[PDB]
Ligand code: HEM
């Protein structure tokens with residue numbers, strides 16, 4: 001499929017690396033959203049509950065657990081849908097479509113997350129976050145953002 005960003009070898013390397021990573025999906029989902037709130041503290045106001053809290057208060061907060069999981073599981077579905085490009089495209093476009101109802105949401109907001117996902121992958125995988133994996137994730141997460149953006153424009 002010409003639409004899919006990765007070669008067959010890099011695709012299998014992705015699914016292998018992600019499935020060991022998805023063992024701590026809730027933990028990594030929390031660290032991803034916290035990194036969004038650390039780097040871009042304006043994003044905290046879209047979730048009014050998370051404004052007053054320290055980083056460790058959120059990690060244990062149940063409303064943060066649900067929000068963190070809802071942001072990491074589309075990426076987990078995306079890796080699962082790597083052979084089904086058409087289902088992969090539908091799911092990522094639907095994700096970008098959800099944000100239209102959110103007041104004052106911008107198209108450029110989605111790109112802030114890929115910096116935070118690589119952070120989540122770095123801390124969770126640790127020594128499993130290899131030189132080869134850093135390259136593969138860089139191309140892949142950038143591509144998912146493009147398709148999430150497509151759902152927001154359309
Ligand atoms: C590109 C990565 C992102 C993914 C995969 C993602 C995923 C999702 C999903 C699946 C939903 C729907 C939740 C549901 O009803 O089940 C959602 C809603 C939402 N997302 Fe995102 N999102 C992303 C980026 C962002 C960014 C950058 C922000 C800005 C802080 C954001 C803020 C929100 C808000 C405020 C909602 C609605 C809150 C609610 O009523 O639940 N998201 N997101």
Ligand SMILES: [Cl-]
Pocket residue numbers: 083084085086087
């Ligand atoms: Cl398909």
